[PDB]
RNA sequence: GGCCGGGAACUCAAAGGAGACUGCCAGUGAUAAACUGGAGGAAGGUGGGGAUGACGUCAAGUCAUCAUGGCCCUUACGACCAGGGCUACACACGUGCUACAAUGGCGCAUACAAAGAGAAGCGACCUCGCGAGAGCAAGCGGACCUCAUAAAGUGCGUCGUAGUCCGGAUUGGAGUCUGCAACUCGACUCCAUGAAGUCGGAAUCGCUAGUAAUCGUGGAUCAGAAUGCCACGGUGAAUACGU
């Protein structure tokens, strides 16, 4: 806004584990105010992912996120009558938010049967450095690299 | 319309039909009553039904029984 | 026996005045009463268009409130009942007596 | 509203009040089950000879000060415009502008 | 001896009585797991006893009415906080810092004339 | 399996499979299976010749396929020949049950013609 | 079983009161007005939402609510009646409802609300009908009786990516109720039928929090006739670096 200071809203932690990251992930997955459905889907997905890797659900989740977090991006400027792409850094909260959004968006487009299966497959591919989310990170970094002259 | 109520007819139309049948020969019967049912005792007569401007002649046959008199006289003109 | 009085009005100061009057007249005549009990108020609502011709927004909204009270008399006497029947209160309250 | 429409309404109310009982009796005959199966027919043929304006469904509510056929309220017997005028003048007990 | 608390949230009201010993919870003549089938509701109802380490030292008798699952759980939490305050009177600082002492005064916003909802407008066109 | 002059799918449940006949819906299908004594979630490929013949005998009690088609065609032709309001609508190609025509009516009209 | 004797504690009902004022603490600033932060507190700096519309602008809208200057018609531009029309249909535009599906469709059984209306009215229990309904008849001018059974949710089964166990336009047969009267032109029920449609070109709209999105419930007009309008509650987000 123009003359405002916006505080932070309090977010409850997860009921099974105790993380706020997982709560934010549930929130980004939910549709139409149906939180129980999203919780069920996420718990099923994490359960199926833990067996494929023999490590804890939280550790697998963090491993998946660390390969999707971005570092730099491009904004649009127009002062000389033309559109320029200006590279900027990304701050941590935005890094996490963008990673989560890209993971869910990639999962929804897959062709497996159930949403839990789609999410599990997408997370495993991300942990191995494959999939549309990782391709998106690559594209963003490429565009930011091709414009370092305007920094 | 409910079956426990019987069919609906106008009293004056019923009386006119009875008189025509009993007295034999008839010329067309003029009527403004488009909401009346067609009874079996009308077969063979000619009823002229109102449509807003004119009276349209309907020669009653046995496939028309049970319908209302107004379904054989359209009200709107279109080409 | 037992007597029940129901009072209704559009104005709560009027209703309270009348209730206190009834309580005092019952207590002075040698009886016992069970104090007035407030009962839920009724709110009726209306909504109208305020232009003689087409402007579908631009409405007004009105309300009428109906206040209600109940009083009970437990051990009456002939003089008390006659005194109650021979009384008149303000001209905006409705009183109903059940024996 | 024209002066003839109000007269029409008055006539309708009069006839509907005049013929109230006859109609109720005939309708009870027609409706009641286990009737003669011929009295029903006769009552059906008799109900339609009474005047048309004796059916209470031929009546239309109107404002009691102007005759308007639209925007009627039943508690007040008036239309919206007259309701508002009286309310602002203070001629309807208990009524006032509301907020919540 | 008993200790009492009253709690309120969106449209719900909750009465709570607490006594010492052998932690058992009864709500509307049923157990916690039978009444609330939601893990979020269970966690909310249990938060303050976990905060102040008295989970297995107090019996709780509770009644509630109005609202829905989340509102009832929140009202119960408020009531338990107040009852614990009555019981001890030195846990107020910790409960306040946790945030359980505040009444959450968020209600539903009314519908307004000319709008489809409290804040939603109909579609607009220039031409 | 051939039932009423047609083949019906063999990998579905019976209650779904029997609706491939023209004139048999969900309710009639349930009635047929109840009268024949076969469960509803049994595949048609897990049955026997005697059971299939029982089904044939039960299905024979309704009007289906060609007979029903002839019935409907005669129904419509009657009105068209009689020349009532409904018949005129039928042979003009417009709605019959009193729907609007200023807009819509595209299921009976077809796509637009400029 | 709040069923019964009782009790006046609590939830709730509705009348009188208390409370929030930059009042207290530190720093900044002109020995100011104010500003950033902290304590206690249910709530903090306009705590949230309503009502409340300055002098004037557009010869803006309304002589068909009503009233009114000037014109105009009086065996007619004024009465009365039955039938028809305002519902037409090659086409163009605005506002909405239902969908194109596994965060789903269908079957069984099981929690948790708020706010309203009712005597030419609201119509329980029981019997008959697959059903819309019908028959006989208590109670209530109502914190007591009735409308009235919340839904999304949760548990257990099945469907396995197909124009399908997705969608429900059209059309044929058989009925119910209101009403003198349902052809033109009503709403609803049963059996059968089973269209377009797989997320929408150039444009373009709403919303900063108990909001958007999604789920049900009530009223006015009213013999009958809402996907519109006016109200009520359940679940419940994302984001704001900056001009």
GROMACS .gro file of C-alpha atoms (C1' of nucleotides) in nm, chain E residues 4 6 8-11 13 15 30 35 38 65-72 92 96 101-103 106-125, chain G residues 9-12 40-43 47-50 93-97 111-114 150 152 154 204-214 228-236:
model
   88
  433UNK     CA    1  -1.518  -2.303   3.745
  435UNK     CA    2  -1.684  -1.980   3.137
  437UNK     CA    3  -1.699  -1.808   2.457
  438UNK     CA    4  -1.610  -1.802   2.088
  439UNK     CA    5  -1.793  -1.726   1.766
  440UNK     CA    6  -2.142  -1.842   1.868
  442UNK     CA    7  -2.080  -2.109   2.513
  444UNK     CA    8  -1.901  -2.429   3.110
  459UNK     CA    9  -1.896  -3.845   2.616
  464UNK     CA   10  -1.697  -3.616   2.076
  467UNK     CA   11  -1.063  -3.393   1.456
  494UNK     CA   12  -2.357  -2.550   2.313
  495UNK     CA   13  -2.389  -2.339   1.997
  496UNK     CA   14  -2.166  -2.296   1.695
  497UNK     CA   15  -1.952  -2.559   1.525
  498UNK     CA   16  -1.647  -2.780   1.582
  499UNK     CA   17  -1.382  -2.506   1.579
  500UNK     CA   18  -1.590  -2.263   1.784
  501UNK     CA   19  -1.669  -2.524   2.048
  521UNK     CA   20  -0.150  -1.590   3.463
  525UNK     CA   21  -0.110  -1.449   2.890
  530UNK     CA   22  -0.637  -1.515   2.805
  531UNK     CA   23  -0.779  -1.304   2.520
  532UNK     CA   24  -1.135  -1.334   2.396
  535UNK     CA   25  -1.429  -1.204   1.547
  536UNK     CA   26  -1.789  -1.241   1.429
  537UNK     CA   27  -1.964  -1.265   1.093
  538UNK     CA   28  -2.016  -0.941   0.898
  539UNK     CA   29  -2.370  -0.850   0.799
  540UNK     CA   30  -2.512  -0.837   0.447
  541UNK     CA   31  -2.562  -0.493   0.292
  542UNK     CA   32  -2.800  -0.340   0.039
  543UNK     CA   33  -2.677  -0.335  -0.319
  544UNK     CA   34  -2.411  -0.602  -0.263
  545UNK     CA   35  -2.422  -0.979  -0.307
  546UNK     CA   36  -2.248  -1.034   0.030
  547UNK     CA   37  -2.078  -0.824   0.297
  548UNK     CA   38  -1.809  -0.701   0.055
  549UNK     CA   39  -1.873  -0.865  -0.286
  550UNK     CA   40  -2.002  -0.633  -0.561
  551UNK     CA   41  -2.192  -0.722  -0.879
  552UNK     CA   42  -2.014  -0.719  -1.213
  553UNK     CA   43  -1.961  -0.378  -1.373
  554UNK     CA   44  -1.956  -0.281  -1.742
  679A      C1'   45  -2.498  -2.156   4.194
  680C      C1'   46  -2.365  -2.152   3.601
  681U      C1'   47  -2.585  -2.095   3.072
  682C      C1'   48  -2.962  -1.751   2.909
  710G      C1'   49  -0.125  -0.359   3.303
  711G      C1'   50  -0.579  -0.496   3.064
  712A      C1'   51  -1.145  -0.870   2.755
  713A      C1'   52  -1.019  -0.472   2.437
  717G      C1'   53  -1.114  -0.154   1.908
  718G      C1'   54  -1.495  -0.387   1.450
  719G      C1'   55  -1.981  -0.273   1.162
  720G      C1'   56  -2.402   0.068   1.069
  763C      C1'   57  -2.583  -0.714  -2.628
  764G      C1'   58  -2.604  -0.699  -2.042
  765U      C1'   59  -2.695  -0.972  -1.560
  766G      C1'   60  -2.721  -1.491  -1.356
  767C      C1'   61  -2.787  -2.061  -1.257
  781A      C1'   62  -2.203  -3.535   1.499
  782C      C1'   63  -2.231  -2.992   1.550
  783A      C1'   64  -2.622  -2.380   1.426
  784A      C1'   65  -2.814  -1.884   1.392
  820A      C1'   66  -2.923  -2.824   0.866
  822A      C1'   67  -2.069  -2.936   0.353
  824U      C1'   68  -1.671  -3.829   0.962
  874U      C1'   69  -1.270  -0.757  -1.934
  875C      C1'   70  -1.470  -0.781  -1.330
  876G      C1'   71  -1.461  -0.850  -0.771
  877C      C1'   72  -1.190  -0.877  -0.320
  878U      C1'   73  -0.676  -0.657   0.227
  879A      C1'   74  -0.982  -1.099   0.721
  880G      C1'   75  -1.372  -1.405   1.008
  881U      C1'   76  -1.270  -1.089   0.395
  882A      C1'   77  -1.253  -1.387  -0.091
  883A      C1'   78  -1.410  -1.908  -0.206
  884U      C1'   79  -1.757  -2.306  -0.078
  898G      C1'   80  -3.426  -1.252  -0.859
  899C      C1'   81  -3.429  -0.923  -0.400
  900C      C1'   82  -3.372  -0.867   0.146
  901A      C1'   83  -3.160  -1.128   0.600
  902C      C1'   84  -2.900  -1.575   0.897
  903G      C1'   85  -2.531  -1.895   1.049
  904G      C1'   86  -2.101  -2.348   0.938
  905U      C1'   87  -1.578  -2.435   0.719
  906G      C1'   88  -1.215  -2.095   0.613
   0.00000   0.00000   0.00000
